[PDB]
Amino acid sequence: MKHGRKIHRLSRPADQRRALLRGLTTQLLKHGRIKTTRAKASAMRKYVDKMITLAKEGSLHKRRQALGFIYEKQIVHALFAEVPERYGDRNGGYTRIIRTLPRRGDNAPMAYIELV
């Protein structure tokens, strides 16, 4: 029974679910909008918030954390060298989950992420 377990897991096995979250957050921090099924939206929400706050504190150690999580190299440098101005005193709750019509082909609930 689920009772108590609160790790949002996707349709995928462990390894591939990791990979999906890392790639998917990378591409969020790259474009700012994104379109994923709602479940992927929630699972993103957690991690991308972690990366943002990880950039709010731009010491080397943390920079190497993020350097290890995100795939694309230079989106990180742009990111932490850019955001502690954007999200100065926003203090948590960085995304926004403006949702949208389903996906012809699955009628799969589909949502559309922001950064604000």
Partner 1 sequence: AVPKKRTSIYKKRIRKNIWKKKGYWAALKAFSLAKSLSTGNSKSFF
Partner 2 sequence: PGKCDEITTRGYSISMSVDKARRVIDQIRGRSYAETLMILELMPYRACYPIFKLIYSAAANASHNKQFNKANLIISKAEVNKGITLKKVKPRARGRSYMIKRPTCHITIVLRDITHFDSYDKFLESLTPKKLIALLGLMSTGRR
Q: Report strand pairing: 108-113 vs 34-37.
A: antiparallel
Residue 101 as a binder of partner 2 (CB under 8 A): the answer is yes
For residue 105, state whether it binds RNA (rule: CB under 7 A). yes
Q: What angle do CA 36, 40, 43 make, to 5 degrees?
A: 145
Q: Are 103 and 96 in contact (CB under 8 A)?
A: no
Q: Which stretch binds partner 2 (CB under 8 A): 24-32, 75-83, 87-95, 99-107?
A: 99-107
Q: Is 99 in the site for partner 2 (CB under 8 A)?
A: no
Q: Is 108 in the site for partner 1 (CB under 8 A)?
A: no
Binding site for partner 1 (CB under 8 A): 96, 98-101, 112
